[PDB]
Amino acid sequence: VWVVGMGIVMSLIVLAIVFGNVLVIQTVTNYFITSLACADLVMGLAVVPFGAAHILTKTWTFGNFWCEFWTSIDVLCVTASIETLCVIAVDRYFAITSPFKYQSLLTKNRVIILMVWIVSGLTSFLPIQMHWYRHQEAINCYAEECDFFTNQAYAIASSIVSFYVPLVIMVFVYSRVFQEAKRQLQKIDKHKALKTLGIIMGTFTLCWLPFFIVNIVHVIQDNLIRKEVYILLNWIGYVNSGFNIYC
């Protein structure tokens, strides 16, 4: 009852998220947000269904190339979604903080979305293609057809490029917008903004920040966290794709 019941929840969650994301997907911001819907749809169509089957005690052992592709798609999917939020924040800062030139800076001529997607795919599929990863326990795992690991600070580059860099911009960008609103309200006179900023940023932080802490920790030192807890953290982190609060 317990093992089967958990699979029912995860299978429903994967299917439930797919319905919401597809329905949504106008202005430049709508075109920017369309990338989030595309990434969520791709995730729900490809990665989410395999997750329950893999988490089940029996492993499918479908293949080696298919497993490599499935592992590689995770970086491309996660990096694409997180990077777009920084672009949205930058666009909002341009629109709000600088009143004229909003129209002389933003143009229809897509290009930034393609560049971001290419950058996200650069760090995902290339390590899978070259197939050179990394110990005795690390070895002999791929001989029999799933362990995850990283060496030569691959996780450090993956975390900084995909997660650490966006959050450096996020604090600086969103600090100016809130500061301007506080002084602007005083002018009219002589809570809502705070709630909006909290709703916007708390989900992102509480969903992604704890995961990469363990991601960096497990490789830096000896074994201090189990595989199951790391998998559970990843599963909790995947909720943000369906959680993404916009319109």
């Binding site: 909002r92 629109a95 709000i96 009143p99 004229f100 129209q103 002389s104 917008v177 301007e180 609103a181 602007q184 002589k190 809502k192 903004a193 909006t196 916007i200």
Partner: protein, 294 residues
């Protein structure tokens, strides 16, 4: 024929190229509409932008001014000018020169100018008068509405005599504009014109506001007052009119409707400097509120 349809497609392509180019310009322009009562100074403000941002008529006004004063009856009759209508630009011509003369205008009166890499479009409404103003539904997309009133005319009557004084006509018109179905999401910039004439009237003891406005007797000056330097008698009268306009806006005002009061004199070039107009036009909080409630 095949060539007949080919030519039509080529003609369609040429027009489509120009429409895309012209779509950029229309978006990057700001449009402002003037409003107010008669003999207020809407045209003078427009002429200011031409001078800064980018002979028989003069004598004609002087010709009419001399006859008007004599008909009522010379210097003594000029002092008691409240009873009979007379042109404001009388003493200046009898004794900025091109801006003092008044010329009647029927057709729309437009103006194009650029201040800082941004195009602005200011046009006058025009016309002798209306009680219907059915064209008001056309101006449903302007960014702001500029309102100009005569702050030194509270003891003179409308051109149709035996009517309400000029100030009360402005208050009634402001209420109609504010409570309009079509103009429900347009902000208002308020210009209290003719400040120099108000100072001269208050200094002399010929007339008092308390006679025409009974409520002025018990009025106390606001604590948060900033007399720019400044007699207390002049400052108190100056602020009372400004606060009287505000109580109309705050009553029926909502989240989208705002109001910007200002003090200005139209003839002076410095007081009409579009720098504060530019700041007020860019201080609009539509950008913030909109993305998300913020």
């Amino acid at each position: 024929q095949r060539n007949e349809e080919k030519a039509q497609r080529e003609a369609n392509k040429k027009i489509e190229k120009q429409l895309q180019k012209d779509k950029q310009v229309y978006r990057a322009t700001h449009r402002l509409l003037l409003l107010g009562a008669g003999e207020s100074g809407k045209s003078t403000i427009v002429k200011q932008m031409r001078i800064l941002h980018v002979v028989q008529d003069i004598k004609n006004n002087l010709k009419e001014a001399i006859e008007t004063i004599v008909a009522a009856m010379v210097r003594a009759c000029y002092e008691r000018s409240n009873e009979y209508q007379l042109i404001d630009c009388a003493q200046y011509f009898l004794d900025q020169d091109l801006l003092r003369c008044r010329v009647l205008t029927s057709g729309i009166f437009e103006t194009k100018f650029q201040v800082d890499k941004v195009n602005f479009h200011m046009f006058d409404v025009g016309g002798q008068r209306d009680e219907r103003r059915k064209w008001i539904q056309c101006f449903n997309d302007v960014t702001a509405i500029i309102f100009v009133v005569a702050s030194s005319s509270y003891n003179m009557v409308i051109r149709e005599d035996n009517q309400t004084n000029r100030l009360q006509e402005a208050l009634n018109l402001f209420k109609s504009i504010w409570n309009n179905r079509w103009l429900r999401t347009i902000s208002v910039i308020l210009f209290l014109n003719k400040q120099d004439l108000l100072a001269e009237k208050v200094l002399a003891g010929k007339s008092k506001i308390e006679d025409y406005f009974p409520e002025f007797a018990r009025y106390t000056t606001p604590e948060d007052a900033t007399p720019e330097p400044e007699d207390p008698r002049v400052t108190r009268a100056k602020y009372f009119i400004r606060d009287e306009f505000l109580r109309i806006s705050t009553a029926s005002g909502d989240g989208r409707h705002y109001c910007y009061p200002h003090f200005t004199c139209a003839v002076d070039t410095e007081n009409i400097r579009r720098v504060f107009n530019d700041c007020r036009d860019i201080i609009q909080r539509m950008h913030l509120r909109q993305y998300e409630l913020l």
